Paper text:
To obtain the inactive structure of ORF74, we expressed and purified ORF74 without the agonist CXCL1. We optimized the sample for cryoEM by reconstituting the detergent-purified apo-ORF74 in nanodiscs (first panel). CryoEM analysis revealed homodimer formation in the nanodiscs, enabling structure determination at 2.9 Å resolution despite ORF74’s small size (~38 kDa). Unexpectedly, atomic modeling showed an antiparallel orientation of the two protomers, an uncommon feature among GPCRs, likely induced during purification. Nevertheless, the apo-ORF74 model from the antiparallel dimer showed a strong structural fit to the BRIL-fused ORF74 map, while the CXCL1 & Gitrimer-bound ORF74 differed significantly. This suggests that the apo-ORF74 structure represents a bona fide inactive conformation. To further investigate whether the apo conformation adopts an inactive form, we compared the apo protomer model of ORF74 with the known inactive conformation of CXCR240. An RMSD of 1.7 Å from their superposition suggested similarities between these two structures including the positioning of the ECL2, 7 TMs, and ICL3. Notably, in both structures, ICL3 occupies a position that would sterically clash with the incoming Gαi/α5-helix of the Gitrimer in the active conformation. Structural analysis of inactive ORF74 revealed a segmented TM6 helix, composed of distinct TM6a and TM6b regions.
Kaposi’s Sarcoma-associated Herpesvirus encodes ORF74, a viral G protein-coupled receptor homologous to CXCR2, which plays a crucial role in Kaposi’s Sarcoma development through its high basal signaling activity. ORF74 was identified as a homolog of the chemokine receptor CXCR2, which is a member of the class A GPCR subfamily. ORF74 has been shown to have robust and high basal activity for multiple signaling pathways. In this study, we present cryoEM structures of ORF74 in ligand-free, BRIL-fused ligand-free, and CXCL1 & Gitrimer(Gαi/Gβ1/Gγ2)-bound states, providing an inactive-active pair of structures of a vGPCR, allowing comparisons and insights into the likely conformational transitions.
Numbering used by the authors: 42 to 331
The structure:
Amino acid sequence: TTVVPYTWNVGILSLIFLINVLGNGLVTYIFCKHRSRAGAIDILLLGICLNSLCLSISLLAEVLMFLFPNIISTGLCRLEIFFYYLYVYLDIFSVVCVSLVRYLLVAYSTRSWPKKQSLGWVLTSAAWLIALVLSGDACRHRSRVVDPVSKQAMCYENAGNMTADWRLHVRTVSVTAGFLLPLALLILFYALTWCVVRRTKLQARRKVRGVIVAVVVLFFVFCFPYHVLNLLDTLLRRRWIRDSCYTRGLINVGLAVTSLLQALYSAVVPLIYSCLGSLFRQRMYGLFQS
């Protein structure tokens, strides 16, 4: 059985695509118009918008394949899954980079190099290269297959006699490289920032930045559930926890619910900037008053 009907899934993904594209395109436009006077964390926060825009192509492809089964082909199956994994890796990598740069802003406060655009660009490129490698590795075999039992085409993991091995390998790579290690690095950098602040008893000149914290919190809100349920699913398919029809159906429902949350983070991200950021709020308010 399928948990979310066709109509609900298509509508939700279409609305998410619309808001994603509009919000992150506008944010990137404003950022490119005011680039010259930006900092490292500004570049990272723009990188989050670029990550969200990656998902737009994936969702557009998926929606067009739903609407038009006729155009389902190997090329679209590759492209959709490529952009999907690109988004999934890039979001967590960008959060890790944000944590790294705030660590560096305190570890090297006496230096000026932690606060330049150069650090943001270097970190963004380092994240993008890794995400591209990981996504391209996964999107190699997904092609057009026809089920004998229903005589309809669909995107599938067909890889020959080794289809199951590839199916397991892709999920294992996703879990290990896109949830576990990035989370450990994130925790490490925040713990180091807190430790260095505690050890120095840094003065009250430290004052909170509204935008940075909200995005990091809403990431753990809208995206973490999908990754944890993916980990549970992969544990099912590796027989590290016990099999059961009830458990399988429970996780089948859960994956359906949480996958929509993770896609909704793309729409959530630009709205955080449009309200908690003074520059984005002003500019977008002026644009919308036109």
